[PDB]
Amino acid sequence: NLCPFGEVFNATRFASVYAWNRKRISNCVADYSVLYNSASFSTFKCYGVSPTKLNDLCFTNVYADSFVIRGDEVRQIAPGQTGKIADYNYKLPDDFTGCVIAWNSNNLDSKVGGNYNYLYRLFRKSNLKPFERDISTEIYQAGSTPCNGVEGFNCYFPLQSYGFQPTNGVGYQPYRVVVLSFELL
Amino acid sequence: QVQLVQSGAEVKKPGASVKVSCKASGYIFTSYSMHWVRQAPGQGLEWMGTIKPSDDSTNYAQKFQGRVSMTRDTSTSTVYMELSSLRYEDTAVYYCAREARGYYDRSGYYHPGYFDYWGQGTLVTVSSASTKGPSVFPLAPSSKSTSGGTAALGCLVKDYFPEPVTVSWNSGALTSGVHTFPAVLQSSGLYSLSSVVTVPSSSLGTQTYICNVNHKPSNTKVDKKVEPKSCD
Amino acid sequence: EVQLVESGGGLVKPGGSLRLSCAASGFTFRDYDIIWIRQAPGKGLEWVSYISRSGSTIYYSDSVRGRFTISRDNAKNSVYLQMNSLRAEDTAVYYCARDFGFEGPRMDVWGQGTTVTVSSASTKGPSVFPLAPSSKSTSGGTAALGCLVKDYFPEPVTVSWNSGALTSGVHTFPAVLQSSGLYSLSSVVTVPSSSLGTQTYICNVNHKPSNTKVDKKVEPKSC
Amino acid sequence: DIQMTQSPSSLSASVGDRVTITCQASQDIKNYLNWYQQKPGKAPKLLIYDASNLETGVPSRFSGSGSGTDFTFTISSLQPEDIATYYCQQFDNLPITFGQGTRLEIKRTVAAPSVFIFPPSDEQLKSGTASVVCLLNNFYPREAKVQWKVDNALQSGNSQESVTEQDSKDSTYSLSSTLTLSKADYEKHKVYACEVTHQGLSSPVTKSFNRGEC
Amino acid sequence: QSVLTQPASVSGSPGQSITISCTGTSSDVGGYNFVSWYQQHPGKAPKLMIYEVSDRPSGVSSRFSGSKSGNTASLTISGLQAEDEADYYCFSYTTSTTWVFGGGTKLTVLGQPKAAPSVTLFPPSSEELQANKATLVCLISDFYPGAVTVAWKADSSPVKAGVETTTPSKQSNNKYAASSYLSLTPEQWKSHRSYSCQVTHEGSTVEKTVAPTEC
Ligand SMILES: *[C@@H]1O[C@H](CO)[C@@H](O)[C@H](O)[C@H]1NC(C)=O
C-alpha cells in the first residue's frame, strides 16, 4: 500500500539507456514529498504538472522509467529534444506530462579501468518514436557488401559503452535518471 | 525534424494589412507556443507577441496591442500574424519562432521556455510606391576604369520597384569578375543598383559586353550593350 | 576543439621498431573508428590500418600486414600503431583519422601527422649561420636577412623569427639533401632597411631529433 | 583494389576562373567518395563528402558531382587561398584508395624577383666551408634561372636550389640558391655574383659582392 | 517595455575571452532569472546560445557562458574564434508578462589582415544625360574590416545633398563591398569642374575623380 519508489530510486543497478527499464506504479499511496523535499537531485523538471501538487492528484497510470546516461546528455531527457539519446535511445513525447529527475552517480557507476556495464545506441536509420525501446543488436550495413552478422569495415555494431571512469569530467560522468509519467484523470 | 515554413515576401501600401503564415511540422502543434519577432533591415530584434495554440490565448507587446492579431489553425498546423494599419517603419523581416516547453521546478515555480526552432523569415515591405520597371544605363570602360591590365564595366539599373532585379552578362556566358551590388533605396522611394564586371583591358575592342536585366514584378527584360569609350 | 594528435615518429634503423600514438580530445573518441593513412615524402596518400571502436575488428594494408600492430585504449582516448621490421619505404608522415562509419561525413577529421624516417644514417644537429644584409644608408626600402641551417639529419627543422612575433615577409625554404647525406635549409625575412639599427632580428631554430635549439641574432656586418 | 584515376595531375588558373578536377573509379562506388584539400605542410581537409555534399564551414565555391564511377569536383571562382593539392578518396571497400592527385597553382600577373646576395659568415669559414646564397624574392611565374659567377667564371655542379610553395595571398614564389665552396677556393677569388633571368626582368639582373669589402 | 542596453560593439583577438553586457531594470533582468542570449549571423535567423542566465542548450560550446549581477546580465565568450563574429542579443521576461530584446552588440574577431578598398567612379552616362539626369556611381570593393565611410566633394567643396550609400555587404570571397551614388541634375553636373568620391577606410582615404570635360 506504500508505493515502491525506494526500489526505483535505489536499485543497486540501473538499466542501460538503450534497454531502459519501465516500472509500473499502480494501486497504492505515494508520498511524492520525499522526492521534491530532497535537495540531492541535480535535475528536477516537471512538464504539464507541478511536483508540489502530485500528492493532491489522481492518475490512472504512473510509470517510472529509469536508466543511466552521461552528464551533458541529461538535457536530452525532455520534450522536443534532438541528439544521440533523444533520437536513438530514449525519446520523450512532445505532450509529455510528467517529471524528469536526475542525479550524479559517479561513486556508484564508475570503475577505475572503465565501467563497461552501461551502454547506448550510437546510430539508427530512423529516429525512435516517443517511448519506443530498441534493444536489437543488428550489424548496420553502411556500404554495399552484406555484413552477414559480422563486424567489419562498412559493417558496424550499433552500441557502445560509456566507459565511466571516476576521473572523467562532470559532462562525461554517469548520471542516474528517473522519468515519472502521469496519465491524468 | 521540426520545421517552420513561412509564407513569401509581401509588398503593401501604408494603411493596408498583411497576414503572414507559419506552417509547422514534425511535432505535436498544440504542445508548443509560437512567438513572432521582427527585425527592420540592419536593426535589432523586436518581440511582437505570442499565441498558445492549445487554448488560443495571446499576449502582445503594448506597441502592437489593437493592431496585431495572432491566430492558429490546428487542422493545418499553421500560425498566423496579421498586422493592420501598416506604416513605413513596419518594413521588416518577420519570424515565427517556437518556444520550447516550460517546466515546474521542485518547489513549484514555473520556468518558461526559449526559442528552439525558427522559420526562415518573411520580408514585409511597406512603401507608397507602385510597381515600376527600371531604366538601364551603361557604365562604360575608360582609361579611368583600368588598372593593372583589367578594365571595369557595368550597367546602372535605375528607378525600379519592388525588389528584386537580377543581372547576367552576355546571356549567361560571362560569369567571372561579375559583381552585382545590393540595391540602394533613393529618396525618390525607388531602388537603384549597379552590376560591374572586370574584364581584360585587351578585350575592349574585340569582345561585346551586354548586360541582361530582368525585373519580374514589371515584366521587364532589357539587354544593354555597354560600349567602350575612347578616353585616355 | 576536435583534435587528433599523432606522436612517436622519429629516426629508426632498417628493421627497427617504433610505436606511434594517436591521442583524441574534444569529442567522444569511443564513438569513432580510427584509420591510419601515410604519405611518403613528395607523394600521395596510402591507407595503412583500421581499428574499430571496440578495438576488436582490425585490418592492415598488404604493404604492412604481419609487421604493424594496431591497438586501442578508449579509457586513454588513444589508438596505437606498433611498427616492426621497418623498411626504407615505410618513411612517411603518418596520419590518424576518425571515422563514424554509419554515415557521412566519412573520415572527416585527421590530425597533423607524425614523421617517421627509416634510415641507417645517424642524427646530426645543424650549425646555424647568419645571412646578413648589405649596408643601406638610403634605407632603400627593403632589406633581406636570414639564417642558414646547415648539415643536419634527419628532417625536419623549424624556424621562427623573434619567437613568432615576426611572420610577415618570412620564407623558410624546403631543405635540400646535399651530397654528404645531410640536409641544409635557409630561412629569410624581408624587412625595412631603416629598422636595422633599431630593431632586433633573431631566428629560432629547433631540431627536435638532436634536441638542439639555437637562437641566432642576425645583424648587418660591422665595418 | 579500387583504382581511382584523377585528372589533371596539375592545374594552373586565374583568380575567378572556374576549375574542374575529375576522378574515375575502376568499379561502381555509388556516392562513397570524399574530396580532400591538402595545403602544404598540413593534413588533408575534407571539403566534399559523399560525392556532392559540402562539409560544414567549407565555402560555397566548392561543390561535387557524380555517382558510380565518374566524379567531378569544381571551384566556381578560384581564390588565392585555394592553393593546395586535391585528392579524391573511395570508402566503398578496403583498401581505402586515393587519386594521385592534383596540384593547384594560381596564374597571376608577372612579378620580377627582388634579388639579394649573401656572403658566407666568418663563423662558417672557421669550419673550412663557404656557403654563399642568392635569394630571389616574391616572383611569378616560377620559371627562373640563377647563374653563379666567380671572377666572371660560370659555375656548374656546385650549387643547389629550393623554391617555396606558392604564397596564399600574393600568389608568388621565392627561390634560394646556395653556392658551396671550400674555404681555400673561396679565398682564391674576389667577385661573387648571382645572375638572374626571369620574364619580369627585361634583361638579366646581377647582384654581387667583393670578398672582404663592406 | 524598456529596451535592454547593450554595447553597440565589442572586439577581441582569437583565443581570448570577451564579455558582452546587457543592462536593463529591476522589472526585467533584475526582476527574473529568465535571461537568454541569442547569436545572429548575417541573413539568418537568431540562434539560442544561453537561456535562464547560464544554461546552454544541447549543441552549444562550453566557450559560451552566462552570468547575472543585479540589473546587468553578462555573456562571456572564451577561446574566441572567427565563427563567433556575429550580432548578439539579450532577451528577458518583463513584469508586464511580455518579453523584450536588447538592442544588440556586434562582435568582431581581430587578427585577419587589413585590405584597403578598390574604388571605381563612373561619371553619368550620355544616355542618362539625354534622359535629363546625372548619377555618379562609386563602387567600393575588396575591403576588410567591412566598414567604410564615403564623402563626396564637388570640386573641393563638400556635397551632402543627393548622396545615397549602401550598407557594407559581405562578398563571396569573405571580403566586403559597398556602393555610393550622387544624383544630380545635368545643370548641377556641368556646373563644377571635377567631382570626387572619397572612401575613408581605417584612417586612410582612397579617392577617385571624374570631370564633365572627359568623353
Ligand atoms: C532509497 O531512496 C529513498 C528515496 O527517498 C530514501 O528515502 C532512502 O534513504 C534510500 N535508501 C538508501 C539507499 O539509503
Short mmCIF file of N, CA and C in Angstrom, two decimals, chain A residues 79-168:
data_model
loop_
_atom_site.label_atom_id
_atom_site.label_comp_id
_atom_site.label_asym_id
_atom_site.label_seq_id
_atom_site.Cartn_x
_atom_site.Cartn_y
_atom_site.Cartn_z
N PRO A 79 10.81 16.98 -23.47
CA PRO A 79 10.06 17.08 -24.73
C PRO A 79 10.77 17.94 -25.77
N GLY A 80 10.76 17.49 -27.02
CA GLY A 80 11.27 18.29 -28.13
C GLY A 80 12.77 18.43 -28.25
N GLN A 81 13.53 17.50 -27.67
CA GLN A 81 14.98 17.46 -27.81
C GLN A 81 15.42 16.58 -28.99
N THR A 82 16.57 16.93 -29.58
CA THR A 82 17.31 16.06 -30.52
C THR A 82 18.73 15.82 -30.00
N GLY A 83 19.36 14.79 -30.56
CA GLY A 83 20.66 14.29 -30.15
C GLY A 83 20.66 12.77 -30.09
N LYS A 84 21.82 12.22 -29.74
CA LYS A 84 22.03 10.77 -29.72
C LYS A 84 21.06 10.04 -28.79
N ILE A 85 20.87 10.58 -27.58
CA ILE A 85 19.98 9.94 -26.60
C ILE A 85 18.51 10.12 -26.99
N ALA A 86 18.13 11.34 -27.32
CA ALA A 86 16.75 11.61 -27.74
C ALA A 86 16.35 10.88 -29.03
N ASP A 87 17.26 10.78 -30.00
CA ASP A 87 16.92 10.21 -31.31
C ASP A 87 17.03 8.68 -31.34
N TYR A 88 18.01 8.12 -30.61
CA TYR A 88 18.32 6.70 -30.73
C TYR A 88 18.11 5.82 -29.49
N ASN A 89 17.84 6.39 -28.32
CA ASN A 89 17.82 5.62 -27.07
C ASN A 89 16.55 5.80 -26.26
N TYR A 90 16.24 7.05 -25.91
CA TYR A 90 15.04 7.35 -25.14
C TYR A 90 14.42 8.66 -25.59
N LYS A 91 13.24 8.57 -26.19
CA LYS A 91 12.52 9.73 -26.73
C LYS A 91 11.26 10.07 -25.92
N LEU A 92 11.24 11.27 -25.33
CA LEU A 92 10.05 11.77 -24.64
C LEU A 92 9.14 12.45 -25.63
N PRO A 93 7.82 12.21 -25.52
CA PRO A 93 6.86 12.82 -26.45
C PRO A 93 6.69 14.31 -26.21
N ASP A 94 6.26 15.02 -27.25
CA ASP A 94 6.03 16.47 -27.18
C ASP A 94 5.00 16.85 -26.12
N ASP A 95 3.98 16.01 -25.95
CA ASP A 95 2.91 16.25 -24.98
C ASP A 95 3.14 15.56 -23.62
N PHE A 96 4.39 15.19 -23.35
CA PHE A 96 4.77 14.54 -22.09
C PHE A 96 4.21 15.30 -20.91
N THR A 97 3.49 14.60 -20.05
CA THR A 97 3.03 15.19 -18.82
C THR A 97 3.67 14.33 -17.73
N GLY A 98 4.65 14.91 -17.03
CA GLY A 98 5.45 14.16 -16.05
C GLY A 98 6.68 14.88 -15.53
N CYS A 99 7.51 14.15 -14.78
CA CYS A 99 8.69 14.71 -14.12
C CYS A 99 9.96 13.96 -14.52
N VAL A 100 11.01 14.73 -14.83
CA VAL A 100 12.34 14.21 -15.15
C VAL A 100 13.30 14.49 -13.99
N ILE A 101 13.85 13.43 -13.39
CA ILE A 101 14.67 13.55 -12.18
C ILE A 101 16.02 12.91 -12.44
N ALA A 102 17.10 13.65 -12.18
CA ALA A 102 18.45 13.13 -12.39
C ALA A 102 19.44 13.53 -11.28
N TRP A 103 20.41 12.66 -11.04
CA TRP A 103 21.50 12.92 -10.10
C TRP A 103 22.78 12.21 -10.53
N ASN A 104 23.91 12.82 -10.15
CA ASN A 104 25.26 12.33 -10.44
C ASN A 104 25.47 11.03 -9.68
N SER A 105 25.98 10.00 -10.35
CA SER A 105 26.17 8.67 -9.76
C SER A 105 27.61 8.18 -9.93
N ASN A 106 28.56 9.12 -9.89
CA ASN A 106 29.97 8.83 -10.18
C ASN A 106 30.60 7.83 -9.21
N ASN A 107 30.22 7.91 -7.93
CA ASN A 107 30.65 6.92 -6.92
C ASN A 107 30.12 5.49 -7.16
N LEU A 108 28.92 5.38 -7.71
CA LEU A 108 28.27 4.09 -7.96
C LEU A 108 28.66 3.46 -9.31
N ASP A 109 28.57 4.25 -10.37
CA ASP A 109 28.62 3.72 -11.73
C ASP A 109 29.97 3.86 -12.46
N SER A 110 30.99 4.38 -11.79
CA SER A 110 32.34 4.42 -12.35
C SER A 110 33.21 3.31 -11.79
N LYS A 111 34.13 2.83 -12.62
CA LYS A 111 35.18 1.89 -12.23
C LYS A 111 36.49 2.43 -12.78
N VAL A 112 37.60 2.06 -12.13
CA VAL A 112 38.91 2.66 -12.43
C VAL A 112 39.42 2.32 -13.84
N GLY A 113 39.22 1.08 -14.28
CA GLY A 113 39.52 0.70 -15.66
C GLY A 113 38.53 1.25 -16.68
N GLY A 114 37.31 1.52 -16.22
CA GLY A 114 36.20 1.94 -17.05
C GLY A 114 35.05 0.98 -16.80
N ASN A 115 33.86 1.51 -16.51
CA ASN A 115 32.67 0.67 -16.42
C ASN A 115 32.13 0.40 -17.82
N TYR A 116 32.14 -0.87 -18.22
CA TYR A 116 31.58 -1.29 -19.50
C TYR A 116 30.22 -2.00 -19.34
N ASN A 117 29.57 -1.77 -18.20
CA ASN A 117 28.23 -2.28 -17.92
C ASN A 117 27.15 -1.42 -18.60
N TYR A 118 27.39 -0.11 -18.70
CA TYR A 118 26.40 0.83 -19.25
C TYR A 118 26.63 1.15 -20.72
N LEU A 119 25.58 0.98 -21.52
CA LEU A 119 25.64 1.08 -22.98
C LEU A 119 24.63 2.07 -23.56
N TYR A 120 24.92 2.53 -24.77
CA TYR A 120 23.99 3.34 -25.54
C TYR A 120 24.07 2.95 -27.01
N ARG A 121 22.96 3.14 -27.72
CA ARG A 121 22.93 3.03 -29.18
C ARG A 121 23.60 4.25 -29.82
N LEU A 122 24.45 3.98 -30.79
CA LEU A 122 25.22 5.02 -31.48
C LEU A 122 24.50 5.63 -32.65
N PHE A 123 23.71 4.80 -33.33
CA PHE A 123 23.09 5.17 -34.58
C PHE A 123 21.87 4.31 -34.86
N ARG A 124 20.91 4.93 -35.53
CA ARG A 124 19.71 4.27 -36.00
C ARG A 124 19.31 4.93 -37.33
N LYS A 125 18.89 4.14 -38.31
CA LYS A 125 18.43 4.67 -39.61
C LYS A 125 17.37 5.74 -39.44
N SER A 126 16.44 5.48 -38.54
CA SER A 126 15.37 6.41 -38.26
C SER A 126 15.27 6.62 -36.76
N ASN A 127 14.73 7.78 -36.39
CA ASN A 127 14.58 8.18 -35.01
C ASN A 127 13.52 7.36 -34.30
N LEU A 128 13.75 7.13 -33.01
CA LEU A 128 12.79 6.44 -32.16
C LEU A 128 11.49 7.21 -32.06
N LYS A 129 10.38 6.49 -32.07
CA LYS A 129 9.10 7.09 -31.69
C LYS A 129 9.13 7.40 -30.18
N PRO A 130 8.29 8.34 -29.74
CA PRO A 130 8.21 8.59 -28.31
C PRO A 130 7.91 7.32 -27.50
N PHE A 131 8.66 7.12 -26.43
CA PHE A 131 8.56 5.96 -25.55
C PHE A 131 8.84 4.60 -26.22
N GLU A 132 9.50 4.61 -27.38
CA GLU A 132 9.89 3.37 -28.05
C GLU A 132 11.19 2.84 -27.44
N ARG A 133 11.36 1.53 -27.47
CA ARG A 133 12.58 0.88 -26.99
C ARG A 133 13.08 0.00 -28.12
N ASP A 134 14.36 0.17 -28.47
CA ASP A 134 15.01 -0.67 -29.45
C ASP A 134 16.18 -1.35 -28.73
N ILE A 135 16.08 -2.66 -28.58
CA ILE A 135 17.11 -3.48 -27.95
C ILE A 135 17.77 -4.43 -28.95
N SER A 136 17.52 -4.21 -30.24
CA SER A 136 18.12 -5.03 -31.30
C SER A 136 19.61 -4.70 -31.40
N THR A 137 20.43 -5.70 -31.77
CA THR A 137 21.86 -5.52 -31.97
C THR A 137 22.26 -5.99 -33.36
N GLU A 138 21.51 -5.56 -34.37
CA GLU A 138 21.79 -5.92 -35.76
C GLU A 138 22.97 -5.10 -36.27
N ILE A 139 23.89 -5.76 -36.97
CA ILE A 139 25.03 -5.09 -37.56
C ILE A 139 24.47 -4.19 -38.65
N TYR A 140 24.92 -2.93 -38.65
CA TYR A 140 24.45 -1.94 -39.60
C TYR A 140 25.27 -1.96 -40.90
N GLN A 141 24.58 -2.12 -42.03
CA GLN A 141 25.21 -2.14 -43.35
C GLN A 141 25.30 -0.73 -43.91
N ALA A 142 26.49 -0.14 -43.82
CA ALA A 142 26.75 1.21 -44.29
C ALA A 142 27.19 1.24 -45.76
N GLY A 143 27.74 0.13 -46.26
CA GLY A 143 28.17 0.00 -47.66
C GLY A 143 27.29 -0.96 -48.44
N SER A 144 27.80 -1.43 -49.58
CA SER A 144 27.04 -2.34 -50.46
C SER A 144 27.33 -3.83 -50.22
N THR A 145 28.37 -4.15 -49.45
CA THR A 145 28.65 -5.54 -49.07
C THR A 145 27.77 -5.94 -47.88
N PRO A 146 27.01 -7.05 -48.00
CA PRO A 146 26.28 -7.56 -46.83
C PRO A 146 27.21 -7.96 -45.70
N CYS A 147 26.75 -7.74 -44.47
CA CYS A 147 27.58 -7.91 -43.28
C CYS A 147 27.57 -9.32 -42.78
N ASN A 148 26.44 -10.00 -42.93
CA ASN A 148 26.36 -11.41 -42.62
C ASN A 148 26.56 -11.65 -41.13
N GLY A 149 26.01 -10.75 -40.32
CA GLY A 149 26.10 -10.84 -38.87
C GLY A 149 27.45 -10.51 -38.25
N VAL A 150 28.44 -10.12 -39.05
CA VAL A 150 29.79 -9.86 -38.52
C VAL A 150 30.23 -8.40 -38.68
N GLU A 151 30.89 -7.90 -37.65
CA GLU A 151 31.52 -6.59 -37.67
C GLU A 151 32.66 -6.56 -38.68
N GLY A 152 32.66 -5.52 -39.51
CA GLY A 152 33.74 -5.25 -40.44
C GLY A 152 33.72 -3.80 -40.89
N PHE A 153 34.59 -3.46 -41.84
CA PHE A 153 34.53 -2.15 -42.49
C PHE A 153 33.19 -2.01 -43.19
N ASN A 154 32.59 -0.83 -43.10
CA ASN A 154 31.20 -0.62 -43.56
C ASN A 154 30.15 -1.58 -42.96
N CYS A 155 30.47 -2.18 -41.81
CA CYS A 155 29.61 -3.20 -41.16
C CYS A 155 29.71 -3.10 -39.63
N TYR A 156 28.80 -2.34 -39.02
CA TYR A 156 29.02 -1.81 -37.68
C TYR A 156 28.03 -2.21 -36.62
N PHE A 157 28.57 -2.51 -35.44
CA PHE A 157 27.77 -2.84 -34.28
C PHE A 157 27.16 -1.56 -33.73
N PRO A 158 25.83 -1.54 -33.50
CA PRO A 158 25.14 -0.28 -33.22
C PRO A 158 25.23 0.26 -31.78
N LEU A 159 25.87 -0.46 -30.87
CA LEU A 159 26.01 0.01 -29.49
C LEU A 159 27.46 0.28 -29.13
N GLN A 160 27.62 1.05 -28.07
CA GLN A 160 28.92 1.28 -27.45
C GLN A 160 28.71 1.49 -25.95
N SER A 161 29.76 1.27 -25.16
CA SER A 161 29.75 1.56 -23.73
C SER A 161 30.21 2.97 -23.41
N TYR A 162 29.71 3.49 -22.30
CA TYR A 162 30.15 4.80 -21.80
C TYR A 162 31.58 4.79 -21.25
N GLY A 163 32.03 3.65 -20.74
CA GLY A 163 33.38 3.53 -20.16
C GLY A 163 33.62 4.43 -18.95
N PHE A 164 32.63 4.54 -18.07
CA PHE A 164 32.69 5.52 -16.99
C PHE A 164 33.90 5.31 -16.08
N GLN A 165 34.61 6.40 -15.82
CA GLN A 165 35.82 6.41 -15.01
C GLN A 165 35.68 7.54 -13.98
N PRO A 166 36.08 7.30 -12.71
CA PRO A 166 35.94 8.30 -11.64
C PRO A 166 36.57 9.66 -11.94
N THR A 167 37.66 9.65 -12.68
CA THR A 167 38.39 10.86 -13.03
C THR A 167 37.84 11.62 -14.26
N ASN A 168 36.78 11.11 -14.90
CA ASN A 168 36.12 11.81 -16.00
C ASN A 168 35.59 13.17 -15.55
#
